[PDB]
Swiss-Prot record, chain A:
It is an enzyme of class 4 (lyase). This is S-ribosylhomocysteine lyase. It catalyses: S-(5-deoxy-D-ribos-5-yl)-L-homocysteine = (S)-4,5-dihydroxypentane-2,3-dione + L-homocysteine. It comes from the Bacteria.
Length: 149, 151
């Protein structure tokens, strides 16, 4: 359910199946590591990753069915997303690429930003979230194999 | 809608446990999403290092007290944690599990598990003392099952 990854051997940015949990009725939940930054070489600011969370919640769903949710990782170098379905790194990679283009081009208010809809509405940074999305697309994504410790 | 309730964040009372949405799988299992709220929305936020440490600790302690955990992640607003669980909604049972995991967290005086350049993507950004104090603050205030008030 959670592969033991060697963080010194991956090459960001990438999409990686991080684990798979089988449900009691026989379905599968695939977990993905959506890595923007190389582990231990810098982190996304908290405001920017919060904004990425709000933007990717809707844009990943526009390009991929079965999304449970997209969340920030505590290490702030990427996002975690669980999907209901069999593993499909290629398809998730294409959906992530399309959602990042949407994110980089998002030039309207951030969705769900108010004291009513967000637990820290003052901590957002649209420009930095858009630049991180452009940065990933500029470097280029790939499907990263899990290298175990 | 049902996968992610449209909560009016001004009406909740932290700290609390709240079912935040439910998504079903094709064959029929439910993925219950929970809002594990430490701080009152918009009244402060957990430091990034401390929430990162809470993620590493609660990943194992929630699993010690609750079956079917998909994962425990920090919310982007940093006022709490998000957790998806395979099973029908059970706010009371999740509340009891979370309380037990917070007691484990408050009493964690051993290395944070998985903290190294090999095992974590930002190994220097951790704060065990602050994570422990956040956990003790929640237990001191007292948890409850928060109802979802919609906008
Ligand atoms: Zn928010
Ligand atoms: Zn970590």
């Amino acid at each position: 359910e959670s592969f033991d990854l060697d963080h010194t051997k991956v090459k960001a940015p990438y999409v990686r199946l991080a684990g798979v949990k089988t449900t009691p009725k026989g379905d599968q939940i695939s977990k993905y590591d959506l890595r923007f930054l190389q582990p231990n070489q810098g982190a996304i600011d908290p405001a920017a990753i919060h904004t990425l969370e709000h933007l990717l919640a809707g844009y990943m769903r526009d390009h991929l069915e079965g999304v449970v949710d997209v969340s920030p990782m505590g290490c702030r170098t990427g996002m975690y997303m669980a999907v209901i379905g069999e593993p499909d790194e290629q398809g998730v990679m294409k959906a992530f690429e399309a959602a990042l283009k949407d994110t980089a081009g998002h030039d309207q208010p951030i969705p769900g930003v108010s004291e009513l809809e967000c637990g820290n509405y003052r901590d957002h940074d649209l420009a930095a979230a858009r630049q991180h999305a452009r940065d990933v697309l500029d470097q280029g994504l790939k499907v990263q194999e899990t290298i175990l410790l």
